[PDB]
A paper describes a structure:
Nsp5 is a 33 kDa cysteine protease, also known as main protease (Mpro), or 3C-like protease (3CLpro). Mpro of SARS-CoV-2 produces 12 functional proteins that mediate viral replication and transcription and are highly conserved among several common coronaviruses. The active pocket of Mpro is located between domains I and II and is characterized as a non-canonical duplex of cysteine 145 and histidine 41 (Cys145 and His41) with four binding sites, S1′, S1, S2, and S4. The SARS-CoV-2 Mpro D48N mutant possesses a single amino acid substitution in the residue located near the Mpro active site and has been identified in Alpha, Beta, Gamma, Delta, and Omicron variants as well as recently emerged Omicron XBB subvariants, as documented in the Global Initiative on Sharing All Influenza Data (GISAID).
In order to clarify the mechanism of inhibition of Mpro D48N by shikonin, we obtained the complex crystal structure of Mpro D48N-shikonin at 2.08 Å resolution. In the solved complex structure, Mpro D48N is shown to be a homodimer which is exactly the enzymatic activity form. Shikonin can be found in the protomer A and inserts well into the active site of Mpro D48N. The naphthoquinone of shikonin forms a π-π interaction with His41 at the Mpro D48N in the S2 subsite, and to accommodate this force His41 undergoes a dramatic conformational change, also has hydrogen bonding with Cys145. Additionally, shikonin forms hydrogen bonds with Arg188, and Gln189 also has hydrogen bonding interactions with His164 in the S1’pocket. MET165 at the S4 site also underwent a conformational change to form a hydrogen bond with shikonin. All these interactions led to a better occupation of the active site of the Mpro D48N by shikonin. This demonstrates the potential of shikonin as a non-covalent inhibitor to block the binding and cleavage of substrates by the SARS-CoV-2 Mpro D48N. The D48N mutation allows shikonin to interact with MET165 at the S4 site by forming a hydrogen bond, suggesting a better fit to the active pocket. Overall, Mpro D48N-PF-07321332 and Mpro D48N-shikonin are highly similar in structure to their wild-type complexes with these two inhibitors, with the RMSD values of equivalent Cα atoms being 0.565 Å and 0.223 Å, respectively. Shikonin inhibited SARS-CoV-2 Mpro D48N with an IC50 of 2.49 0μM, comparable to the positive control.
Author numbering:
A (entry chain A): 4 to 298
B (entry chain B): 3 to 45, 51 to 298
The structure:
């Protein structure tokens, strides 16, 4: 099963931020609340907002921040790229050990979907190669965050900003820089063609071998270039020498050379799965990383 | 469409490690009682005997760093109830409930008292759970959360050879015809949860996917013969009633959606996908969709 991280450490950091008539989610760490800058926009500003102009007109008491039943007091504010940073009275007593990190396409993380400051659900994700997320967003999940948890330390890698016309989601890192070419404005912007994360499918095939399925193996090998020429006809991401290097341990553990697993995938794409399953799926799964598989 | 698990924070604060001799597994600490699988006292065992021979100093409970002192022990069916010196200050509001096949819940998978991940499950019609349990996940619990109140419905006991998992409710009653002993046991043949497929087709309609919709209607009887041929649970009037809110919401009557389903089964997706799948999901309940 694809699993998400236990969400407790993140749940204790979720707050509700309201400015005027707009409300979304915020993240309370130490004495700062982070949230999307869009909170300061009104209906009429969405098309062409001037965030510098809208923020200069605000004072500290324009921002209503609620942690459960407690109103937090804002004592300063500033903007860093597309995230608003609200200084409050009180350091979050439940602040975990944490860091901000920027991730790359193919990486996985968990998302705590929240509504008006209250967590609702948790799910496991990958950053797609077109810099989008195939999320499940309730209407007011703006400001919900994505994370990884390693040894009790939480890495915040994503903050939700908006839904694209195709149903997918776009957002920023916790420094307010968007993933992909998207902007916090209601324009016509659309996601690029999405491709399958090849290195993740191969890692998962190695996971199938480790758990004993070998049905899809064959006796062929391939060159890297030949593999990529085939795979790209199926909208699979090109495989690099870095990806090959990354799969080396798994190859070592299983005794199957990386380009041999590549030949198996070429054939799986040619034939389908003929009513069969691999780990437990009937689809080529691309949201488990090489790092994930070792775990 | 993503399946979502419930936020697990309220359960995370209840997870402890329990050790008896050489055996270590997970426990649930609520108030001054730790709940865990009785097979923690195993070396065809007689659990009546083995536990009379036990005393409090035989159990080592660890809540993270702190060792808890067992001051009493008792058995309820297949779960051991270890009374400890201190109440868990992180005890949520909670209830013990028993679910039925087809209902969904979240599992907090744990390793030696330490939460590792969370995922959303359904109780299969053969009473097993298609889960991913790591080494030492015994004693992990399943739950729903409703209004800040945790409903504990499942405790993990065993991996079946087929890879699926078997467990009890929190009162130690097994789900399915399984026993906590090393007999040879296998899951019975499983079936697809029809009322959940229908709910997921409703969700697909609510999401703008309408290609599978057709002009026809079927009967409950005609459908169940198709269902039976495809290893689908039979559909009942109760199921139909359950789906009424969705039928009302979408203007698609249940037996008209059934017709759509009959056709999907007989003829296939045919290059089309429904919600981003080419197989029909059966681990979303009608309730899950309404929410
Ligand atoms: C949060 C909530 C929202 O409703 C929106 C945004 C955030 O961050 C946002 O950034 C942008 C929009 C709006 O432009 C709709 C988006 C498109 C038309 C692409 C939000 O609505």
């Amino acid at each position: 099963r694809k699993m998400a991280f236990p969400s407790g450490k993140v749940e204790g950091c979720m707050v509700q931020v309201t400015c005027g008539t707009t409300t979304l989610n915020g993240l309370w760490l130490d004495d700062v609340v982070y949230c999307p800058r869009h909170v300061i926009c009104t209906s009429e500003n969405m098309l062409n907002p001037n965030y510098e102009d809208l923020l200069i007109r605000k004072s500290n008491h324009n921002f209503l921040v609620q942690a459960g039943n407690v109103q937090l007091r804002v004592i300063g504010h500033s903007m860093q790229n597309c995230v608003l940073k609200l200084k409050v009275d009180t350091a979050n007593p439940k602040t975990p050990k944490y860091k901000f990190v920027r991730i790359q396409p193919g990486q996985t993380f968990s998302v705590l979907a929240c509504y008006n400051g209250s967590p609702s659900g948790v799910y496991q994700c990958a950053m797609r190669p077109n810099f989008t997320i195939k999320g499940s967003f309730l209407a007011g999940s703006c400001g919900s965050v994505g994370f990884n948890i390693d040894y009790d330390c939480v890495s915040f890698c994503y903050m939700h900003h908006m839904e694209l016309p195709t149903g997918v989601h776009a957002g920023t890192d916790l420094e307010g820089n968007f993933y992909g070419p998207f902007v916090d404005r209601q324009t016509a912007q659309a996601a690029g063609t999405d491709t399958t994360i090849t290195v993740n499918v191969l890692a998962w095939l190695y996971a199938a071998v480790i758990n004993g399925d070998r049905w899809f193996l064959n006796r062929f090998t391939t060159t890297l270039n030949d593999f990529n020429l085939v795979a790209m006809k199926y909208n699979y991401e090109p495989l690099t020498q870095d990806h090959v290097d990354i799969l080396g341990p798994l190859s070592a553990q299983t005794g199957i050379a990386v380009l041999d697993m590549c030949a198996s995938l070429k054939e799986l794409l040619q034939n389908g799965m003929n009513g069969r399953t691999i780990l437990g799926s009937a689809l080529l799964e691309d949201e488990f990383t090489p790092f994930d598989v070792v775990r």
